[PDB]
Design a protein that fits this description.
Two copies of one chain form a homodimer. With about 325 residues, chain A is of the alpha/beta class. Chain A folds into two domains: about 1-145 and about 260-305, Rossmann fold; about 145-255 and about 305-320, Rossmann fold. In chain A, about 40% of the residues lie in helices and about 20% in strands. Chain A has eleven helices and twelve strands. The first copy, chain A, has helices at about 15-30, 40-45, 80-90, 105-115, 140-160, 175-185, 200-210, 230-235, 260-280, 300, 310-320, and strands spanning about 5-10, 35, 50, 95-100, 120-125, 140, 165-170, 190, 220-225, 245-250, 285-290, 290-295. In chain A, strands 1, 2, 3, 4, 5, 6, 11 and 12 form an eight-stranded mixed beta sheet that branches. The interface of A and B includes residues 22, 145, 185, 186 and 292 of A. The complex binds adenosine-5'-triphosphate (2 copies). One adenosine-5'-triphosphate (ATP) binds next to helix 4 of chain A. One adenosine-5'-triphosphate binds near residues 9 and 76 of chain A. Chains A, B: Its main location: cytoplasm. Chains A, B: This is ATP-dependent 6-phosphofructokinase. Chains A, B: It catalyses: beta-D-fructose 6-phosphate + ATP = beta-D-fructose 1,6-bisphosphate + ADP + H(+). Chains A, B: One of its GO terms (cellular component) is 6-phosphofructokinase complex.
């Protein structure tokens, strides 16, 4: 395991830089040469691959986004296109590839492993969505969660006296976890998520209570995968009067410095990915499951497509509201 | 389980308010009456016990410290003094007591359970130190961790150009966890903790490298349980020249709004404490162990006095630096 490459792919998540830092520093500590691949899979295709030194990752643990960049590379779904990527790594004697991103990003690594025996691939879960098999949490979830809390605080601090209701669109893609944790965290009366059948009427009866009971600043937190904040507002206005504050939180949820949880998590998983390459492993995603650092085959990641939504926690949040 | 009391004891930790909120709201949801005990165990002694309603805990999930207060009550180590506490609860028909605090606080609950069969007691781990058997994390640790990161950022942002070295005293009491996670999180070259034998010389050779290599802003993170920042500075100055920036972070580490992790953790543990009282349980601390919400008898909490320091993570941090 003489040389490894590392790349970041998909949307930004806080702690991607901390994961690259840990890959680079662990590899060099073990006398392995490490190459940064810039712009995700497009970088592999364009040969935008450069040797990293210890100082290349100075001042990065705190840095949001990804200093290697990321780009979309739809053409990487083509087998013939991947041959070009494989040859650019092989050219350089690279024996290991670490991909930091979401499950989409993992598919690319799985293909590279199937199509080149000589390259070992390991996935690191960098995404704010928390929707990757075999890890309880993804690198960015904790940071995203706190970003939502701060945004909701800013909204409330800047709102008018008439604001009876704030409808806040959180990210998540198809997973309700972010909306649920953020919702609980901000004391939301309602949390709208894809895993629970939304009862608009029930929700409207709940706003009209707080209001009738002379209560201000009620929060509806909405996962983008269920519906848009706008849509939620339009649907509630079928029953009750509202256009309070429809706030689409948007891409800021991916920005900002990672939290300490993300820094630590990223770091452990980046070092473990390198340990796994040195151990001869391939075609695995790393994670934290039941408080243990573990590796799961991409097959299992993508087959069992089951990481439980916590209905008990959803019901607690409602209980608390 | 008709009536319960809740109290906060020991030093502040972020999320104490969120835990009280969850106790109060869960109890009322289940048609249990709930009494707030003000000023910790002194409140029990002075009968500073008041009925809480749903609105008594509005605007609290985000609030730092503890709205019931806390006080030191050394006299609660006396059995005769505790009889007064027990009678003030018994007077009111209280059948359950929830104590939010550290292991010291738990001792008081253990005694109340031994000395009054009629009161069930449950402990919730509110402390920034992370030093309580049977939970992997305590309510406040995550918040404290991020507070340290922000303080270190402020120090670096405000420091002079000559600052080659920042010696930063973190809290923790006798546990090195905070120093370790914070140290990793800020990219500290050295982390000084009670669980590792400190080699001052080695540390001095490491500062004098960065400096000789024209490198600025090196961080030594010091657990208060190992030594003071001042002492660390005095000990290093036996070998090399330094008085850079000895910063004692202090009690601010206990202040501030809890993070989302703390809010959620507090909330789940507060609701679980109430579930346990309704189930007939007593003399247990609640926690999160291997990603499961669990309850541990006070005997085990205080006997096995073993919650592993993660040497592998300590060694990773050094690897990354
Ligand atoms: N099935 C696939 N085969 C090969 N490459 C893929 C596949 N799916 C995605 N990719 C590569 O991964 C890149 C990142 O994809 P995506 O936008 O899905 O990000 P992600 O955050 O990794 O995935 P997710 O939506 O699951 O969070 C794509 O632009 C593409 O180069
Ligand atoms: N052995 C004991 N018996 C009875 N009461 C106790 C005992 N130890 C502590 N207490 C009570 O608990 C209160 C809080 O104690 P302490 O200052 O130790 O806080 P803590 O954060 O709960 O403990 P720790 O130092 O383990 O984190 C004390 O002032 C006292 O009323």
């Amino acid at each position: 395991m003489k040389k490894i490459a590392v790349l970041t792919s998909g949307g930004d998540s806080p702690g991607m830089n901390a994961a690259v830092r840990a890959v680079v520093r662990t590899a060099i500590y073990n006398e392995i040469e490490v190459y940064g691949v810039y712009h995700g899979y497009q970088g592999l295709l364009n040969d935008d691959i450069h040797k990293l030194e210890l100082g290349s990752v100075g001042d990065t643990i705190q840095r949001g986004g990804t200093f290697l960049y990321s780009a979309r590379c739809p053409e990487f779904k083509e087998q013939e296109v991947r041959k070009v990527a494989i040859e650019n790594l092989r050219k350089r004697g690279i024996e290991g590839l670490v991909v930091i991103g979401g499950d989409g990003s993992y598919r690319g690594a799985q293909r590279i492993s199937e199509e080149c025996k000589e390259i070992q691939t390991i996935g690191i879960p960098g995404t704010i969505d928390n929707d990757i098999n075999g890890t309880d949490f993804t690198i960015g979830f904790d940071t995203a969660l706190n970003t939502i809390i701060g945004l909701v605080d800013k909204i409330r601090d800047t709102a008018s006296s008439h604001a009876r209701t704030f409808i806040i669109e959180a990210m998540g893609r198809d997973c309700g976890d972010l909306a649920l944790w953020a919702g609980l965290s901000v004391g939301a009366e309602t949390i709208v998520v894809p895993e629970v059948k939304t009862d608009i009427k029930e929700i409207a009866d709940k706003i009209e209570q707080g209001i009738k009971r002379g209560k201000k600043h009620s929060i509806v937190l909405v996962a983008e995968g269920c519906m848009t904040a706008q849509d939620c507002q339009k649907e509630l206005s079928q029953y009750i009067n509202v256009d309070n504050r429809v706030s689409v939180l948007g891409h800021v949820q991916r920005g900002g410095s990672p939290t300490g949880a993300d820094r630590v998590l990223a770091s452990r998983l980046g070092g473990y990915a390198v340990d796994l390459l040195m151990q001869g492993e391939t075609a695995k995603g790393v994670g934290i499951k039941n408080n243990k650092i573990v590796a799961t085959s991409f097959d299992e990641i993508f087959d069992g497509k089951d990481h439980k939504f916590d209905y008990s926690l959803y019901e607690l949040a409602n209980k608390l509201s």
